[PDB]
Design a protein around this ligand. Structure first.
Ligand SMILES: O=C([O-])C(=O)[O-]
Ligand SMILES: O=C([O-])C(=O)[O-]
Ligand SMILES: [Mg+2]
Ligand SMILES: [Mg+2]
Ligand SMILES: [Mg+2]
Ligand SMILES: [Mg+2]
Lengths: 505, 500, 505, 500
């Protein structure tokens, strides 16, 4: 009857439903890029493969994408159990990085508090960085930094303070540590002039169209003009690639609504965000963006350091278990793993842990309160909209095993997902890209029908409907005698305006 | 967002869109049994004709019934405009009445020694001796019991008991010919279904009434009796338990479950229980019937001053509006249409008030409460019906068109109280008439023959509803509507479509 | 947990609290003006005496006011049980009335549908009205009426239609009936030019100041300028007389907020209102005005035909019982009886019936939902405001027998009443006018302390506090061992900012 | 109005007014026991000092306690700025630990044959033989039981049982010197209060600790034991039941009622129950403690990465904020302050996050829920406290000033969660220290002598609170505050006053 009361009723012994609704995005790298590991990644719950273009070459990422597809297509030959896997390109963007440490002896020079460290832009030191001279790739740094400005290195773990300036920078180490090679540099409060879409970004995005990626995670989006530039580079033939704008700076937060209108989805990139803005404020930015994306019906991803300790450990910290649960409770459509699957020692346990936590968090959601709050914040005239709210309400009413949705664009399924049913949304599609991109929206279980299209539209409709029925049975979503809502089109669909309540045969 | 902010924004200059959804039940008597007047009352908004069997002969009511059907079928030429009219039987029940005065009245004043005797010699009654028809009245009540006569207006308290009753008048007044008696705080052993009740109930079965208003229902046992009396030939006649004594209120939950509907019979209830409490019982019963999805009627003295005057009082206008706001499926007129001088105006007044009160309901708050309190079931029709009402709100629908043979699908929609009218297409004439018990259901009777192709017969009946809604001003071409059908000859299918 | 659920829990066998919170205003007339009947009127529940100045003379109303005070002061000599009684002046206002029927033979000429009735303004027929010629006192009627306009007579029971005009009016009777003498005439939809404050009104209001009336019920207020004129005539020496603006025309509804800001309170005068505007719309106007008066903290009276059948019958109709209950449920501070106590055969039963119904309706109110809705619609900086909301919340928390309030203006008590506690508000005052006017606000039980003011402010405070304790005990509001909230002043009160929770000794 | 609209409006550029209300509990160890560092941790926001008695000697902890009190009383010169610091004893409890390796580690890999023996010859441990300290481990678990070692990181399943345990390694790893063992899905007969527990609990009584964190509380029986062990001399020491196994969660309601508070001890709980479920248990327990008005602590690994790094991870920042949003009275740091390289920064980080999360709470929604769920009682102090919190919201108060000797009045205010700080004026030094268990209570210790006139002594202590609030930036002269006092030497009086 109230949020506190429902929160008092939570029971660790009540088991969740079989379906896990939140998507899991795994950054692929050396720990996960083999075909055989990728097969186990999919079996453990991976829905999207993220490729970070801050590193690597096109030849290298081309191979990974080929291995990702090879592992994905091995589970074909059973369309009932086949799980679509999407491919995401994450851009480098206007990123600032140090150079390579001097390779003589060991790596990781030690930076000590109070020590002086000169920062240079002279490429003679580009591969000879040490505890005296440090090179970085931002060629205009000595025009957006002043005496007293603080420079952050390696995920903000190292802080520096500019003590002298020049057309170099003499700093003093404030927070000390071990300095590795090519580490990320953040300049909070400074107006970094780097472009939104660099020359490399153009190249990386065009390679994304040739590789038929399903979505782009665009880094450091500060405003809608940045999103439009990504959109233009993708141009036509990239027109269906979803753009997920990553919010990781203060301007991106302040201009979020502008960015959200231009974008197909949002990523809370808390790594960069928590250095650019004070780390105590990230939770406010996350919940605001997830809430705003929820009311707009647009996918939102929670990212960056969700299970960070599982790079080295087989079990997460209690904060990391809490973070994944709270992100699902916040309403995130997808959760992300970055170094935990790309480079760490326990990538499959990390994927498995996210699957377990998210399923338990989905059970803990007070569904009607969300549904009522989502209904209030939206009286439109779209029959497919009304059909979607009606299908969700009918699903609570009869405790539906699933809402089966027939769509080739995904829009019909996406509209159901906005209203957050408990029952899984089995989205039957013949479009493979739609099956892949459907993982961006919580609760959609994309199934790719490969049967040839029947002569009678009515016979083709129950074919795809029946296929959803065998899909749901085999995966444990429902059994015979249960009831499911089926959403189909008007006539040879258009408006998705035909809802039925069907017992499972 | 809150109820207070909703009242604060009620606007008298906002004209009510959305034609009237609450059914109007009109008691027929001498001032309205004319075919001509009955035709005008249908035009004014009558949906159900009530025949009070506390008075009159079987021959008299059967001729009223014949006139009702004559006036109703005079409009049958146009199925688009035809408004079905139901017929209701209101029983006598365990009524205690008084004797005939030596037609004129006598005057009893306070302190007077009024005596009550069951010896039927006195049946044909002075300010000294009063004959009652309840021969076991004694020992049912005792010292200073407070018996009431003539609508509670005349009060009396007992002084001495016997085999006969010696009483002292508490509240005086005039008349005393066949006037009713109430014994509050007493257990009248008189049974719910008397011989006149069984014979009258059998008369309704043969007269093909659509529903029965069973007076003085005290317990579920009394509903089951009425049902088995109506028998196999009267299975489909709906039984509305009238609640008009304290026992009926105390056992309401069991009476509701056994019944098809409830009437708040405020006339007797306001005597059997303190008058300052009728409002509590009325809102309690209407609320529970709303939660149960069963029809509830508010009745008795809603526009009482219009028996003699062409406009109602301010209290009467409030009472009709608040009954609708309470959640009543039907409002009722008894003497205002049976014996009054302005029966047409009373029907028109209830039409005007009910439509203003319907437009003042916070519909989406009421729907959400009924959605939130809806039990979880596996009936696809219930699931379809909740979804259809949710859909109708999100797309601000012009109507919900429901195809049904028994009415159950339309009733399930009406339980969740959509703002949009429910056009119920049926081939069953009784279903069309019975649909008037549920708020929002606008029944239309299809007389076109059953096409062999199932999908063609659906498309015929849906097209019929489209024509009805366009003709009645419910919606226009291009407006969005919801259509509820089956696909397996379960009403499990909802389509959100523009109007052709 | 919801309004429907609470409404399903209503129990006719749960008895209400002893205190009845809604005020009862009784119009005094021949049926009620004797001292002895007035004594029984007070004992039956009368809190305000309304004197209608549409009729009578000053000499006549002076006697009634004297008898009202005589009956009121007989219960003095016990300040514990003494009940203050307020006196209200109801103005004639811009009222239109027919003349006197020809006295030859019997009264009540019969007007028949289709008959012609000439309306004249020639005073030769002023006392010779019949079924052929009818006189009325609006001298400019034939400039605000046109052919086809409808004229209403005797509470709208008779309707006429102007068929010919002139510097007379030839009409045809539409709704027929018996025509009595000096009956009220309404002209809906016409711009009646009669002044808001006539010469008679000025006289009647000045007589009200000399008679020390507590409030004015101003008829036919259409706008704030009308209220200001009443305020000016009362002027100084009338400054503390509360003005209750009666809303009984369409303009008064349309300009209600303007009127409410200028007025000290509002009366829904449904008699005239239900003729001026369609009778099916009165309930909308009533609930809107009562709601708006509730959120503004200003008294609202429901009036006119609440128990109309009890003019002639000893028991009301079911609609009349419903009307009184629903008016209390709507939130009306006071309910009114007009002809039921002024001229009818059962004035004491009518007063008693209103007391019984209102007490049962007060029990049926879902108090927390009102309190929360009243809290949301109002964060001010007034400590006496905060103290009042805190006292009400504390009263629900401990099921207080009463909230004792020490005030000489009543404002402190009025602020408690706005938030609608269940517990009665025992307002201890030494001001007699405050004790009388306190009946305008639901839940305030004014008690007039006549003890001489003590030397020590602290000793005077518990004196008045203890007096409230003996008041509450004797009237059945609480007993020893119960708990009551007491509201007192800061220091020798100012801000009413001292709340206590006290066990009853 | 809704929660979604509230999140949608959260603004990172709105700076938090209203100083931090959630208490910070810091475990003291080698990296923080210095008087100098302890002085800086008080300045950084430490409110309670936790001494883990799973390690260390009585002499060691007593010197830590002495240093805590040395650093705390260094600020005693100014009673306006003095921040009382409490001392907490965390017991060992029924801990199963392992033997010392022949300090260095050994490497166990999957499939390996690790044997467990209770013969204490092996106590001083190879990749072949592992000695446990729980001599009755056998028959408490059986085939393939899944025993866990070293924070759950190393997993093992049994193969053969005996009087000794033969196991196959499931999850490998390094080390093995005095590392903890957990047996999920098992009923360790080991008792809640061991001999070391009773002796350590008696040491706290003599060391004048303010509270006890009782490890591995499984049932109300275990709380009552701790209380009677603490005895008459330890009546006022508050007992916080740590919930860290499945039985403690299943019997939470009975443990809560017997306890003065609850700690969510997530370290062990995340091993004893599946890790994906700790969030459910944490929000369940915090919610029930909030409803009961009893302190609840969130603990264990909140900023774990700051043992080695000067900034926390994004998951750690979320965890602290969501704990505050859950409704935790206190947040806790264990190894981050006991043995880490950045103990001051960890305390500072929890201060920053908690104050941001406090400013993000929909306070009036949370208060209304606690008001709505508040039981109806006749205690004037409860009634005063709800009224004072309602008053503080309506007038946007700068503080609620509560005079109290035992703390009960301030706790009753804190139960209803006002936004305004609660300044609790007390002459009882233990009450001031114990006040840190409840969110919002800012304790100030009065050392001025008791004036003979009662009203003068009140006016002294209220004036002291006014000076504290002005000095700490809580409010300024002219701001509105609420003061709660008694009049009969019951805190039954509320005055809404400007600040002098
Ligand atoms: O029988 C009835 O209708 C009544 O009592 O009102
Ligand atoms: O003991 C503890 O604090 C735990 O298990 O987290
Ligand atoms: Mg990148
Ligand atoms: Mg009856
Ligand atoms: Mg008047
Ligand atoms: Mg532990």
């Amino acid at each position: 009857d109230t949020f506190l009361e429902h929160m008092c009723r939570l029971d660790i012994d009540e088991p969740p439903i079989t379906a896990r609704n939140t998507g899991i995005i795994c950054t692929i790298g050396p720990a996960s890029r083999s075909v055989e590991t990728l097969k186990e990644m999919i079996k453990s719950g991976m829905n999207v493969a993220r490729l970070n273009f801050s590193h690597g070459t096109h030849e290298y990422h081309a191979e990974t994408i080929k291995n990702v597809r090879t592992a994905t297509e091995s589970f074909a030959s059973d369309p009932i159990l086949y799980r679509p896997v999407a491919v995401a390109l994450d851009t480098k963007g206007p990123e600032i990085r140090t150079g390579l440490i001097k390779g003589s002896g060991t790596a990781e020079v030690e930076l000590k508090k109070g020590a002086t460290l000169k920062i240079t832009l002279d490429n003679a030191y580009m591969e000879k960085c040490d505890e005296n001279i440090l090179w970085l790739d931002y060629k205009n740094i000595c025009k957006v930094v002043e005496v007293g400005s603080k420079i952050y290195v390696d995920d903000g773990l190292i802080s520096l303070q500019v003590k002298q300036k020049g057309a170099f920078l003499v700093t003093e180490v404030e927070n000390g540590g071990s300095l590795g090679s090519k580490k990320g540099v953040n300049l909070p409060g400074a107006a970094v002039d780097l472009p939104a879409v660099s020359e490399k970004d153009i190249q990386d995005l065009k390679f994304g169209v040739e590789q038929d990626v399903d979505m782009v995670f665009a880094s450091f989006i500060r405003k809608a003009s940045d999103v439009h530039e990504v959109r233009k580079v993708l141009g036509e033939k990239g027109k269906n690639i979803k753009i997920i704008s990553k919010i990781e700076n203060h301007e991106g937060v302040r201009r979020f609504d502008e960015i959200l209108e231009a974008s197909d989805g949002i990523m809370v990139a808390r790594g960069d965000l928590g250095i650019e803005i004070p780390a105590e404020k990230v939770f406010l930015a996350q919940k605001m963006m997830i809430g705003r994306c929820n009311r707009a019906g647009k996918p939102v991803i929670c990212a960056t350091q969700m299970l960070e300790s599982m790079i080295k450990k087989p079990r997460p910290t209690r904060a990391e278990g809490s973070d994944v649960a709270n992100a699902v409770l916040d309403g995130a459509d997808c959760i992300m793993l970055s170094g935990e699957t790309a480079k760490g020692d326990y990538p499959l346990e990390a994927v498995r842990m996210q699957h377990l936590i998210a399923r338990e968090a989905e059970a803990a959601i007070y569904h009607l309160q969300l549904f009522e709050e989502l209904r209030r914040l939206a009286i439109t005239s779209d029959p497919t909209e009304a059909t979607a709210v009606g299908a969700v309400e009918a699903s609570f009413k009869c405790c539906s095993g699933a809402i089966i949705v027939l769509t080739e664009s995904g829009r019909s399924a996406h509209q159901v997902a906005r209203y957050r049913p408990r029952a899984p949304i089995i989205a039957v599609t013949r479009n493979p890209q739609t099956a892949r991109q459907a993982h961006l929206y919580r609760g959609i279980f994309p199934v790719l029908c490969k049967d040839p299209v029947q002569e009678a539209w009515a016979e083709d409709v129950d074919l795809r409907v029946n296929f959803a029925m065998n899909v749901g049975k085999a995966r444990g979503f429902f059994k015979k005698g249960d009831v499911v809502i089926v959403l189909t089109g008007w006539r040879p669909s258009g408006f998705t305006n035909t809802m039925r309540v069907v017992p499972v045969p």
